[PDB]
Structure formats: structure tokens, C-alpha cells
Symmetry: C4
Subunit: 454 residues, 4 copies
């Protein structure tokens, strides 16, 4: 249970704006003494899960996050081929070493210039017969004509070390380097991947998320429509480390049948069920065989679900209630309320959630599926696309209803530094050495609306 200050007993449900964490006595020295590992069987070393939105979760996303301890859920109704290709792709990559943008000398500049923003490295590797011949920057593509081959503008001067080199060392070697990128080579000199000054420090801090075999973890999603038993079967055998059943209203007959369908197959994987804000719904979903319940519906007062239907629940209260009902049944809770700030993640955890799912916040990064554009003011933003009877399509569609990028820190690895830094500080304030202790030792209070006045 979560403690509230004596006397604080609202006649209303609480949002993240309604509450505050009171610091207690703390024996925790520094943030680095905090274990952010999750016990929910997701195998994540940080309480961060990326949403099954098409705009957020691509190949590059799943890779980058898992390396740093998180996990990414792949969108439902995605072609099974594309899925299996992505799983094998990610599960095959290096734990400490990233995957740079590769360029053949035959490619154009417009290809080179557009591919540079697809990773946070700030440089592209030109590859010949599987060996690095040099690097490409935005500075190099500046004045060059769009259709010129990249062989002309390539800068062949860069730093190199063998794969498996001690990261502490790799940072010192990159110190005076004009480019922040270090190209990592296999024993035979072929390209392993790259590493940066900060990207090196990450390995020292973030523990990667791996499966039984030591491959980076990844997850995928499925709707309640069509054959649920079939899709879950296909997705599981494609190497998925976790499954997610997702729908708008998670407490409904079709969902309960769907969980039963997947539970019967006994795939031996953690199973996550759709969205509910109530304890009743949390029990009904776990009883149908879900291991983990994801919670949010209409969490914001002015959000589109709420303004349309009047339906929803304040997120703090919703997570607090559902997480408690889950612990009784020996299960866990995911917070699916949209999170734009680190305190959203910290509070979600303090309320008893084991993990927090992050949405379109992450669409504003290099690693998201969309292409990077620029507005009239030349500010960066990423843009993507959300794409059987002709008459029915119009009939169903009758009732049926980009994000800015931070120029300073544009990589998702930076957003995670921001998130984990805050959550680590939260733990030091309450005196917890980890997420289970956070839920135990946390003390909260209620504040009024008056504090938000100006």
C-alpha cells in the first residue's frame, strides 16, 4: 500500500498534478546506488517500455532501447514477415556497440543527406565490401550537389578500435577527436558498428535487456480482431520475448475471450492485457490469464477520449487501485497514461506500477520511424503515416475519428537519461534503493489547484 499524509483523504480521484512525494529518511548515497530493474518478468533494467504506436516503434527504436535496458513493443497487425525480420535484426546486434548508418560510394548525396538524421551519431560510415573507408557529416553534404556520388566528399580520417575494447579506454581515445564517433572493427577488420563518448558511458551505467540466449529483448502486439490464437502463435515463434493484447476498452467480452485464446497456447511468455482503469477490470483480465495489466483510459480531462465520451479516470488513482488489485492475484501493472515528464514516470512507479509505457513523447527522436523535416523557422520535427468491403469502410469510417524535436538532445538515449535521472532522484528522496522499495517506503500528500496559479 501507499502512505498518504494524515488527514489527506480526498472526495475525488487523483491525477499526477494532484499529488507530491514527501522525502523521508534516506541511507542512499548517490543515484548510482539505485537498481531500476523490474520484477514483472519483462526483463527490463529500467522501468521504461515503448508503446506499440507505429510512429514510435521501428527497427531502430527497438534496438537502441533494449541496449539501454528498456524494451519496445511492435505494432499489432504488422506483417508477420516484417516482424520476424526485425526480431532477428535486433536480437543479432551488439550489446555495447551501436549500429551506424552505412553508405556505399555509389549512393547519391540526397540519399546520404537524408540518411544522416536517421541516427543520433551525427556521422555516416561509408562501406566498401564490408569495410569502412571513411565518414560523412552534414558539413560534408553542405555545398556538394545533390546528385554527386559520396566518393567525392568522403572524409577518410577517423578513429578505430577493435570490437570488445574496454569502453573506459575508448572514451579517452575519442577525447581530442574532431568527430565524436569511433568506428568499431571486427577481428578481420570488417565493420562491427560504432561508439561515441557518451554512448560509451552508457555501457558503464545502463544494463542491457537480454533473453535466455543473451540476445536483446523485444516484444510485439496483437488486436482482439480475427484469429487471436493464430497471431500470438506466429509472433511467439518469430522470437518475441513478450506479448501484448491491446484495445481501447480493455474490459469487454471480446478481450476476455482473446486472453483465454492466447493463455491456452501456453507459450510460456509474459502476457499483457489491454486497457482498464478499475480493480474489477484488473481482476477480470488477470483471471482470463493475463500476467500483466496495462492501465489508462482518458487520463487527461481535456484529451480527445474524454471530450468525446466523457469516459476516463485520473491516472494516479487508476494506477494505485489497479496495481493493488494485481498484487493480490500475484501480478503486475503497466502505466499507459501518456507521459511527457520524468515525474510522470516516478509517480507511476510510486503508485505501484512495475513498468511505465511511453507514447508519442519518443516520436520526437532520430530513432523513430518517421522522416526528419524542418518548418519555416527551420526547427526539426519528425513525421510518419498511420496507414475490407468498400461500402463498409465508409460506413465504419463515418463514426471514426508529427511531434517537435529537441535540437539540443534529439536522441531517445537522451530522453532516457532525463527520465532515469529523475526516477533515480525520487528514490534517493524517499530512501529507497530500488523500485520495490520505492512502492513500500513512499509517502504522498495531496495539494490543491491553487499552487498552479499565476
Amino acid at each position: 500500500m501507499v502512505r498518504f499524509l494524515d488527514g489527506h483523504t480526498p472526495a475525488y480521484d487523483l491525477t499526477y498534478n494532484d499529488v507530491f512525494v514527501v522525502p523521508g529518511r534516506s541511507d542512499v548515497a548517490s543515484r548510482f546506488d539505485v537498481d531500476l530493474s523490474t520484477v514483472d518478468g519483462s526483463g527490463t533494467t529500467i522501468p521504461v517500455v515503448v508503446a506499440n504506436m507505429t510512429a514510435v516503434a521501428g527497427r531502430r527504436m527497438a534496438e537502441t532501447v533494449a541496449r539501454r535496458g528498456g524494451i519496445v513493443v511492435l505494432p499489432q497487425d504488422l506483417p508477420i514477415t516484417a516482424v520476424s525480420e526485425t526480431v532477428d535484426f535486433v536480437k543479432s546486434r551488439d550489446l555495447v556497440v551501436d549500429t551506424p548508418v552505412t553508405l556505399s560510394p555509389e549512393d547519391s548525396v540526397s540519399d546520404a543527406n537524408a540518411l544522416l538524421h536517421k541516427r543520433a551519431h551525427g556521422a555516416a560510415v561509408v562501406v566498401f565490401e564490408g569495410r569502412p573507408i571513411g565518414l560523412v557529416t552534414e558539413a560534408n553534404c553542405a555545398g556538394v550537389d545533390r546528385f554527386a556520388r559520396v566518393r567525392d566528399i568522403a572524409l577518410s580520417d577517423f578513429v578505430t578500435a577493435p570490437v570488445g575494447t574496454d569502453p573506459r579506454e575508448v572514451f579517452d581515445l575519442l577525447e581530442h577527436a574532431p568527430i565524436d564517433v569511433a568506428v568499431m572493427t571486427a577481428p578481420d577488420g570488417t565493420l562491427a558498428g560504432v561508439l561515441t563518448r557518451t554512448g560509451a558511458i552508457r555501457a558503464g551505467i545502463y544494463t542491457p535487456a537480454v533473453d535466455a540466449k543473451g540476445r536483446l529483448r523485444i516484444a510485439a502486439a496483437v488486436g482482439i480482431n480475427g484469429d487471436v490464437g493464430a497471431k500470438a502463435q506466429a509472433l511467439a515463434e518469430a522470437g518475441a520475448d513478450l506479448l501484448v493484447i491491446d484495445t481501447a476498452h480493455g474490459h469487454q467480452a471480446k478481450m476476455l475471450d482473446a486472453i483465454k485464446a492466447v493463455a491456452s497456447l501456453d507459450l510460456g511468455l509474459p502476457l499483457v492485457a489491454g486497457n482498464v482503469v478499475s480493480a474489477e477490470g484488473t481482476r477480470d483480465l488477470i483471471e482470463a490469464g493475463a500476467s500483466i495489466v496495462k492501465v489508462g483510459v482518458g487520463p487527461g480531462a481535456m484529451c480527445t477520449t474524454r471530450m468525446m465520451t466523457g469516459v476516463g479516470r485520473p491516472q494516479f488513482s487508476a494506477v494505485v487501485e489497479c496495481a493493488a488489485a494485481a498484487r493480490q492475484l500475484g501480478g503486475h501493472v503497466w502505466a499507459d497514461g501518456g507521459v511527457r515528464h520524468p515525474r510522470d514516470v516516478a509517480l507511476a512507479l510510486a503508485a505501484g506500477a512495475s513498468n511505465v509505457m511511453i507514447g508519442s513523447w519518443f516520436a520526437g527522436t532520430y530513432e523513430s520511424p518517421g522522416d526528419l523535416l524542418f518548418d519555416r523557422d527551420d526547427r526539426p520535427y519528425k513525421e510518419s503515416y498511420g496507414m475490407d468491403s468498400s461500402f463498409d469502410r465508409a460506413r465504419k469510417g463515418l463514426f471514426e475519428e508529427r511531434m517537435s524535436l529537441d535540437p539540443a538532445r534529439g536522441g531517445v538515449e537522451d530522453l532516457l537519461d532525463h527520465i532515469t535521472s529523475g526516477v533515480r532522484s525520487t528514490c534517493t528522496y524517499v530512501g529507497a534503493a530500488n523500485l520495490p522499495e520505492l512502492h513500500e517506503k513512499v509517502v504522498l500528500g495531496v495539494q490543491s489547484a491553487a499552487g498552479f496559479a499565476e
Copy 2:
């Protein structure tokens, strides 16, 4: 009664911003499985009533809304002759087939271009001796001089089907057509009306609201001044399906007298009374013979009524209370608190209101009485006019707000009222699937609500 979460028991009354609906267990598959019919004796198949405001309710409003299942109340103190003409007109139209704008070749272009925005069809039908000779678009009237006859610019190429044709086919016939309008023809080849691709699907979903004789329903309103019995008599005998007695302050002797006056005549029509926010006022009006009580007074905290007198009530609590009082007396409540969002409609129904009266929200549509203008930014808006004894009027006008006529912005993408009704009914339908209700009574029985603070709006 409506349930609230355990422990939520506020020291204040609640507005629509204070509450939220909590999803329960639901066996309802999709929105299409929900029955939006109302039991209050209004006969609407969707919980929407259009207000008796002069700006919103016209012939074109009454026709269009009733076809999709709502109903429109005509303004009070409207000329009795003018009423009957509107009544006979609406009752005479087609259930599945709309009414396009008609044009004789003798008419000017400036007339045709001003008539085009009076309906959502995007096309006008040119009629000769009661037969279609072609269509007119805004594209045709673009460069032609204002005073040219429309015979010159007419495009005689269009789509046609006999009246009574199965709508599913009609959608297919319009599939690749450059114009979204299909002209429907009578047995003798005369013009029945039109249908559009989207307009076809509506008939598939929305059930029209009809009377005993199978004619579209329409309603009218009456003031408490003068002879209420006579006005009510006349309107009733003019073909009105429902009556509305309307005044600012619904709880007062003159209103109770007005209702009895209408009730004694026993016109056998549903009777609705003026406006009240309390259980006492709701009982008093039903005892006077009102069938249905309309509720809102000064609903908004910053609205003109509240800022003027300090008087009003938060609408959710008002609806809850008044609706519970009506059920005991075996009667119903219409929510007249202004609705700008679907969730306003959803919550009113969840609070126990049988039907929801929709206000100036519908003034921003093609089908409303006003002419469509354009501002300095070339954004569309509709504008109408709110137009007495011997200079005594000046004495009375001194305390009167003296508010001149106003205009409302129009949504360019979806500018027809039928689009707004898609928006409204969609949300209400999702509300029901969220609570697990298959219909409006079930929404009221099974709904669970909770209270949130103001901090969530920060």
C-alpha cells in the same frame, strides 16, 4: 439513480468539468450495437433536440435533423401562417432522399452562388418544367459574371436513379463520379430530390423520426405572454408533434398558469416546460401538466446570466436532481444547459436526461437560417437577425440587455449539421460501450461516475 465511486461526496455542486465516467464490464461489441432511441414520448431515434432559437431552427434545419432522428422546435412568436407553411413543408419531404437547391435558367449567377451554401450537397439542381436539366458547382460560378443567366454555365452531365432505389447500389453508382450528388427521379421523371455517397450511408444508420402518418416530426414553442391556450391550440392544429413552453425563469406563477392552460385543452401532445434547476421546480411543473421538464439556468460560471445576477446552477447536479424527481412522477427531463462537445451530450444522458437540447452549436452549419459570409481571413461564418408598443418599448428596453444579432464560425471540413450529428452520436455510442449499456435507459442504470479536481485542467 446514478452511482458515484465510494468516497466521492463533494461540498459543491458538479459541472460537466467536475466528473468522469468509469468503464465497467461490457458485452457490447461495437457502437453499431447501441440503441439511441428515447422513451420520453418525443419519438426521436437519437438523443438530440434542436433548440427554439431563431438563428438555429428553420425549415431546412427541421427537415435535415428529423431525417436522421432528431427533432427541431420552431421559435415562439413565429407567425402562425409561417409555421403552418414550414410544418406542411417538412412533413411532405422524403425520408431517405434530401432536398437539393432548385434553379431556373432565368435566375442569375449571383443568386445561384448564394444559394449553393444553403445545403451541404455542394451542388445545385437546375430544373426545367419540373425536370432536372443539369447541375451547378461553385467551380461553374467562379469566373462567370454575376448577371449572366445560369443557362450558360450549366453542366448537363450528372448521375440519375429512380426514387426507391436501394441505397447500397446508389453508393456504388456514385463511386467514380466527379460529383458526389446523385439526382433521384420520380416515376414520371420529375425531381424527387438528391442523395450523396455519405448521405446514402446515413439512411443506413440513422432512423428517421416520423409521426403516426409516417411524416417527419417537428415541434414548436410558445411564450407565457398573451394567450397561451390560443397559441398552443393554433400550433397544435397546425400540425406540431410536440409543444414547448419556454421562459427564462421556469419556476413562477405565470409559467404554472401557462402550463395548466395548455394542459386543460388536452391536445394529447407531449408538453415541455420552461427552465428549472431544482427538484421543487421540476415537481411543480409536472403537476401543472408538463410531461417533460427542461433544465438549465445560468449553467456557466462566467456566462452572461451568472455574471449579471449571480444566479444559476452547475448543470450535471441540476440534471441529476431534476431527472430523479421526474422519474418519481413518471416523466422526463431535457437538458438545456448549453452543449459545445459530445461529452456534454453523453454526461447529460448519463445523469438521467431523456433528451438533450442543442444550442447555438448548430448555428455554424449550412442548414441554419442565416446567410454564409466570409471574414478578413476568408473563414466561413453564418449570420442571422433577431428582429412593441408606443415608445413604452424604450422604458422596457432600458433594463433589457439589448443584444444585437450574432454570428457563429463554420467548420470548413465538415460544415453540415449531419456531420456534427456523426460527431455527437459517435461519442455517445462509445460512452454506452464503455459503460456496457446497449441503450439509453441502460446507460442511466449502469453508469458509474467519479469526481476530479480542478488541478487536472492545469
Copy 3:
């Protein structure tokens, strides 16, 4: 006592934004059936008192308001000679007939054009040997040189009737007239004053506030510094109908002594005391001999007093508590919290105040002391000026807020204070019809209130 809805019992004090009035059953036909008269011994026929601020209360203010039923308090520490001149000026004017701006033909245009906006009539009367020779409008001062004599531009065509003429006829005679002013003539043909079409209806509605002799009422203020008893005596013998002892903090030893000082003289006048928000202060002030207690301190959350000291009380709760303490001791309460809306006056009366003091709101009118200027956008505004050892003067000025004189915006449509009074009494009149009261005592007795949350303001 004030009734609240069952269950509304907040853990906090209330502002006017916290509450709403619930309409009850009402037998009151129209607004005109409401008696706005006050029982506190002020003698006002409307619940409005104009503040003793230098920007607001001048000769023209005192005249215009008293005519329409209010009373104006003259600033404290005003020279006693100047006071007596103003009192005699006001008590000497006509009850039904206003006082026009007067012009001698010798006067310049710059004087004439600047004098025109000092009254709401929109025209000035040109006087020769005490007889009207014509009128001057703003249209007349347009092209004429600033220094030309006004004899050149005068329009000698206007409407005239004898003083004492029935107002109803005067409106009919002015019906088609190009100028809204009718010149009233004495028996000897000399100028008595003027009247307008609207100014005529006011007399039909507003009951003037008069003393025993039938003279318009007026009041004055006095500070707590120096000799209080002496200052009060002077003011009383100068013809002041009411006295006001005024200070920032009304609850302190020095304020109690001042009241004892004025009460001991037994001048037989209603006595008003400075400002407190508490029951305790309201007793102490009445016990010290105050007839009426004025209440507000730091009403606004963000106002300068609140932001400087952290001190104050939410006005609704302050008036309710203080009015309760006043009644028990057989006295009345003035609401001194700043009012920008009709509802502020209404909610104040409902809370139990006998009269409501209106502040700088009225400074934005023609009839206020300031000169009328215009900004870069040519929008009208009024501006006024707030004008012992220098070492101590510098010493006292050190902690002083040191706020220079301020100006207020003017509503172009209705700019005369009489128009603000129409706005206010209209709202207060409607509040009464909603609650079912025929008058202010009944308002306080029969009113029902409720509490609302902050969420409604989102």
C-alpha cells in the same frame, strides 16, 4: 440567515466566484415590481453607495447619482469651504431635471470642446443673461479654430418646454428631434436645466434620494488622524446627510477612539466606520458607537494588499459573517469589496449587506472628476490627480507604496454613470425575481445559495 444547499459546507472561505444563487418559486411578475430601497438609514432608493475616492466623487457625481437614488461620499481631508460649496451646489439642483454644461458666447472652442465630455448629455447650453440662446455639439467643434468665440458656431434650433412639464409629453416632443436634449425653462424664462429622452425615463424608474427638506442626499468622509470630533461637526453643519469614518485597518484602538469622539457629539446622523472583515471587529466598532460597518480587506487573492501583507478575507464570507454580527447589535453592513459586475452587488446584498460601495468602477464615466483623454487608438479614458518636516515626509514616503494617479477605460456605448446604474440595478432586480423577493429584505431572507468548484472556470 443565508441558506446553503444541503451538504455544501466548505473547509474554506468563499469569494463571489465560489457561490451561485439557486432560483426558488417566484410570484414576482417583472423587475419593476422590486423595491430596491434600503433600510439602513442611508436613504438610498437603490443599494448603491459611491466611494469616497478622489477620482470618483465630485460635484457632478453627487448630483447625478442622488437623482437616481444613490448617495456619494465626499473625500476625507477635503477643504471644508470646498465641501460646503459642493453640498450647497448639489442640494440646490432639480430632482427631475439635470444640469447641462453652460457656455458664454465669449468662451473659446477649446474650452467648449473640453467641457462637453464632462456630462453625458452630448450637448452644451449657450447662455445669455441667464437665458438659452442655443446648443453646441461635438460636430460643431470639428472644423472651427480652437480660439474662435463660440458665438460663431452656435446652432439656435432646439426644443423647449416649461419646467415642471410632464416627462411623457417631453419624450413625444423630442421623438423626431435631431438633438436628444430638451431645454427646461423657469417661469421667468431663465434656464432651470435640461432633460433627455432616456434621462426622462429614469425619473419614471429611479426614485431620488432626498433629506427632510426634500434636498438630494450627500455624504462625507473623515480620516482617523487629528481631531475627529471637530472635523465631523464641521461636516454635519455643512449639510452632510451621513458620515463615514474610514481607514485601512478598521479594527484598532485608534479607530475605536475616533468613533467614540463622533458618537459623543450626538449629531443625529448615520455613522459609518472603516474596514474590517471579522465578527469581533464588527462588534467593537458598533459598540464604540458606529451605526453601519463597512467591510472588506484584501478581497482579491492577487490584489496589492494581499500580495504585500498576505492579509485579507474572501468577500462573500466576510459580508455574511459581519452582517450577522451587525444585525444582532441592531445595525447594518456596507460591502466595500471592489465590484466590477452586477452580480457582485447582488451577491453582496444576498449575503446580508444593506448597501454596496462602488469604487473606481465609476471613475470610467463622463460624470467623474477627471478630464477625458484619448489614447493612441482613440479610445476614451478618464484621468485625475491624487495631489510634515521633509525629513519625516521622506521618512514616511520610504515605506509608502508611492503610487501615482491612475486612469480608467470608458465604455464607448454607455459612458454615463447613469448607464452603469441601469446595468447594475437590472442585474440586482433579476436576482430578486429569480429568488422570489419583492425587495432587499426579502432577498436576504428567501435566497438559497450553493458552492461551485474551480473546475467550472476551465
Copy 4:
């Protein structure tokens, strides 16, 4: 305990926006009759302590505030040499007479024009071999070339009176003077300092804060990192009148050890401890040997600490709780929530705090360490700078959040002007509750709670 109106018992904790002070019966004539002295052993005659921020607290600051009765805490990890030089500098100055900007005839104009805004006097004193030869105004630096010697533009016409002259007289002499500055001369004619028309009135009002030796008081801060005993000893021996141990999270093991370390040395100075919002934390710090407890954490709802971690407490409710625990143990509480308004100081005192620490509010003043710049609109603002292991700088800095600037009020730009604004309000608060002093303010105060609707 503090009284709240009957019926006010919120289900939530309160910020300053939540509460109001109710006026009681008052025997207090005028504001001047109110005694703002503090009993906490700080030795301040006004309840104002300047925060230990690098942007706020300089030499000039420590001097100006102590003279008017407050005290300034010097930043931690400041070089011990610089500290003693600053301490010896401040403790050496004059009680009634300020320290003007001094100029040698050899200094350039670009130096003089930049040196003029470092003090609020509006004039610089040109000094020759320790004697005044004249003054420099902004009007003098207008047309002169930046590199021309200042000997050329000097105005030798000014007002002079002996040091020790009665301030009222000094005010009259300055009455018709074109310059508001009066140069005060020592017995030998050398420059003692200056005094202005308003600065004179201040001496009549504000009582200076001094130590046993009659020297202006000053304080310093220390972190919990490294050797705490060592730093504290040196700072004490450097002439520091009061010590403050400061950290983000005040309730933790490392802090308790740090306080015990400084308490064991028995330096006989008032001791202040880092930041906590709870009664438990207030006791644990006092029990560890802290004399005074500083309280605030994440006081604002939208402030970075709260938006980052979700941690904090509404300040009013926090101070009330902590001060209650401190009074029981015979100790005191400082209000460390950042204050932008006089009402913040008054209410903090109403809550039982003996002193109120003022933050970056005072960085926007002439006397703060930064240089005074001007923006595109030519509006004044002050700007300063917040400047071991090579691998750790990258590792530790990963989780770490640059120097900031504050706008300056053109009307009132000196901190003494801010002190007039602040003490004016706090004084009225006391006259409103009827208290003649801060102990009486806490005793006699009545409060109430308001809703958010009032801010609409």
C-alpha cells in the same frame, strides 16, 4: 500552535496561495513601532537572510544587507583565501556610511562606465592618494571616448560633511544638490565613504547587524562532501559569525554525520542544517546538533525539482509542521522556499519561521556579483557565472541538469529598495494582526483557507 478559522480543515497541504491572514484587534499605531528583530541567534534586526547562491552573494551584498539589518551567507566551496578577504573586508566597514565605487584618474572610461552600475549611488568617487578630487556620473561618460582618461571629464563640484555628522543634517545639505551623493570625510580629509538622501533615512530606520566586537555580521556555507570538520573550523577561524550546512536532500545519513562533525567541534556559533519538509527530519537534524532548521523542497508544483522527480511539499504547510517540531526542541526554522513577494516573507513568519531566506530575487540588483547588461530593448539585467576527475566529469554530468540571469527593476534597482518593499509589507502584516514584533506575530495570528476560484 497556529489558529485557523473554524471549519478550515483541508484534506490537502497548503501553499502560500492557499491561505490568508485575518486581521485581529490592534493597539499598534504605525509600522515604525514594530520590532523585526529575530531571537534565533542570527543577530538580524530584520527577518531576512540572503541565500548562499553564487549569483546573489558577493562582497558588496554582505556589506549592504548587514548594514540594514540582514545577513548574507557565503557560498560553499568558495576559496578559503577569498572568504577571509571578504570577511575581513565586510567586518571592517562603516555602520552608517556606505562604500562608493572608487576611481583613479588613470582608469579608462570603459572601466568607469562599467564600474558605475556595481553600486546604487549613481556616482563614482575619483580618488587621489586617498583623497576625494571629484565625482563621475553616467552623464559624464556619455560623449567621452571609451579610452580617454577620466581626468578630463571629472566634475569637482560635490557636497561634503565630516564623518560622524548627524544624517538629518546631511540630508538638508544634499537638498538642492544636483548630485544625490554626499562625500563623507575622515578627520584627516581622506575618503570615509558616501551617503545619499534616502540612505540617510535608512540609518534612522534600519538597525545594523553586528557581532560582539561591533563588526558587521556575515555567514558562510559548507557542503557535506569532503572533510566537513576541516572546512567548518577554518571558516569559523576566518571570522564567520554563523554557519550553514546545505544540501538538496537534508534528511539522509550523510547529512547527519556532517552535522555531528561540526557540532563536536563546539565552535559556539549558530548552526543551520540543510533542507527538509517533515517534522521527523526537523528533529533528526536538531538531534544531530543543528541549532536551526532550513526548510523547503520542491515548493512549487511546476518547479524543476517537482517536474523531474515528483518530490516536494507545499511550503506553508511544510514550515508550520517543521517550526512546531523545532519550537518543542528549543530550536528554530528558516523558510527556504524561494520568495518573489513581501507576502511570502510575512506568511512564512506567520507560519512560525524565525527567519526567511531570499533567493535569486536579489540577483536582479546592483549589488549582486554579476555584470549589468542591457537587452535589445535596452532593459537592465544582471548576469553571473556558476563556474577534479577527468572521467567522472562525463559520468556524473550525464544525470546532471548553465548560469542564469535576472531582470532588474528600473525604478528600484538596489537591494535596499527591495528591503524597503519587503519590510513595508511585513510591518503592515504585524499592524494587521496587532503584533508589535515577530514573536507576537506567530502568537497572535489567525489564518484561513481559500479555494482556487478566487484566482479566476
